[PDB]
Structure 1
Amino acid sequence: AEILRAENIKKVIRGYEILKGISLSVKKGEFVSIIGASGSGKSTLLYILGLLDAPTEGKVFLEGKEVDYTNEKELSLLRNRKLGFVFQFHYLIPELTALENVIVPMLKMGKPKKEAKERGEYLLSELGLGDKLSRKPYELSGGEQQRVAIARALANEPILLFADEPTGNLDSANTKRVMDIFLKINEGGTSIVMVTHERELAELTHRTLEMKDGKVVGEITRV
């Protein structure tokens, strides 16, 4: 039940081939991790798979349909409708409450405000922030802000979450809390593709792609 495929993806950045021909697929419901040395192309690949950057060569298919990277507005539309993102950085809006931050993407897509606020409240309860709904981000710790960002990532019921180093800058306890959140999300059926520096975190996922110098050099599958 493919949800994502890449075919012969290459990416040139400043005259160098950062990605050198990658093909992969991801099934609906799968938790896939990507590991490899710094400069291997892991984040570059994730940004292409997540419709943030276009490939130089190759094709990407989302839910079995080829992605057209040539109209920015239409690409943003598809991305906002289908995908959610978590990064090391939380990109909260500091003048808005934790609740308001979560419903932003829903309002953007035209979801009615009542319905949107209820969803933002369900999501935030789900992620241990029911008590911080009205808090502004500069009041929240990094770990709490990550939980706001994950709630927001789930706002439009995405079919795929992309996570780029989601536990960076997080202590042990918050790293475990956030990884457990991802595990529970994936259990509910949402696919996740996660780039990580931590092999111990990759070990908790169903499949790991190992990268080196812009190629996939290894694949690890865990049952």
Structure 2
Amino acid sequence: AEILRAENIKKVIRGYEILKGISLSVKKGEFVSIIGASGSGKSTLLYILGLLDAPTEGKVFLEGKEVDYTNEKELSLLRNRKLGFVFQFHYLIPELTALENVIVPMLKMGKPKKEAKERGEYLLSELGLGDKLSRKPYELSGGEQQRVAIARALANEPILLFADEPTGNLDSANTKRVMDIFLKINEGGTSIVMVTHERELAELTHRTLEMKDGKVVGEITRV
């Protein structure tokens, strides 16, 4: 069962072709990693696969259905319902508690606050933050902040989780903790597409796509 498909993706910025024609497909349950050096365009690709930015050319299919870029508000809602994001930076709202930050995507779906908070507590508890539900971002360490972002990414049980160097700001201890969380999330059936410049992290995934100068130049499959 294919969960995501990108066809002939190109991205041009100021006349420069960042992505030169990329096609790929992700199957349900796969943990994919995308690596590459400077100029690879790996993050630009991730933003397009995640429906954050529209490509210059090409199409994206989510669960077999072609994405409609005309209706941007509907696309934002589709993103919120089916996809989760974990960037290098936590992007937590400073005024909101850990729990309030996690329920944001749920409220966008029109979920009652009562039930949203119950699931939010569940998610935070599973990620080891059950005792810090009312803590605001300024009261959390880097590793805890990233875990709140992960809980938020899982808010609406996404079919796909996109991660852009999720452990970039973390020390070795939190890097292992976060990767283990991702492995557990994947074991739970959630597909993951993760960009990273760390081969050691890529080696823990099912498939690694290597990019160079806006093209996928190779792939290594580890079952």
CA distance in 2, matches of 1:65, 1:123: 29
Contact 2:208 2:220 in 1 (8 A): yes
Contact 2:77 2:108 in 1 (8 A): no
Cα deviation for residue 37 of structure 1 reads 0.7
SS in 1 for 2:69: coil
CA distance in 1, matches of 2:19, 2:168: 23
Contact 2:3 2:28 in 1 (8 A): yes
Cα deviation for residue 70 of structure 1 reads 2.1
SS in 1 for 2:96: coil
Cα deviation for residue 141 of structure 1 reads 0.7
Cα deviation for residue 146 of structure 1 reads 0.2
CA distance in 1, matches of 2:115, 2:169: 34
Residue by residue, what CA displacement relative to the aligned partner does 1:191-222 show, whole Å, maximum 9, x if unpaired? 00000011000000000000000000000000
SS in 1 for 2:175: helix
Aligned residues: 223
Residue by residue, what CA displacement relative to the aligned partner does 1:14-70 show, whole Å, maximum 9, x if unpaired? 111100000100001100000011110000000000000011111110000111112
Residue by residue, what CA displacement relative to the aligned partner does 1:146-175 show, whole Å, maximum 9, x if unpaired? 000000000011110000010001000000
SS in 1 for 2:76: helix
Residue by residue, what CA displacement relative to the aligned partner does 1:102-129 show, whole Å, maximum 9, x if unpaired? 0111112110111111100110011011
CA distance in 1, matches of 2:90, 2:32: 21
SS in 2 for 1:211: strand
CA distance in 2, matches of 1:102, 1:189: 21
CA distance in 1, matches of 2:104, 2:21: 36
CA distance in 1, matches of 2:7, 2:138: 42
Aligned CA RMSD, in angstroms, stands at 0.7
Cα deviation for residue 89 of structure 1 reads 0.5
SS in 1 for 2:211: strand
TM-score by length of 2: 0.99
SS in 2 for 1:125: helix
Percent of paired sites with the same residue: 100
Cα deviation for residue 142 of structure 1 reads 0.9
SS in 2 for 1:95: coil
Which position in structure 1 is the counterpart of 2:203? 203
Instruction: Decide which moves more: 204-213 or 72-81.
Output: 72-81
Instruction: Decide which moves more: 64-73 or 177-186.
Output: 64-73
Cα deviation for residue 71 of structure 1 reads 2.0
Which position in structure 2 is the counterpart of 1:38? 38
CA distance in 2, matches of 1:21, 1:33: 19
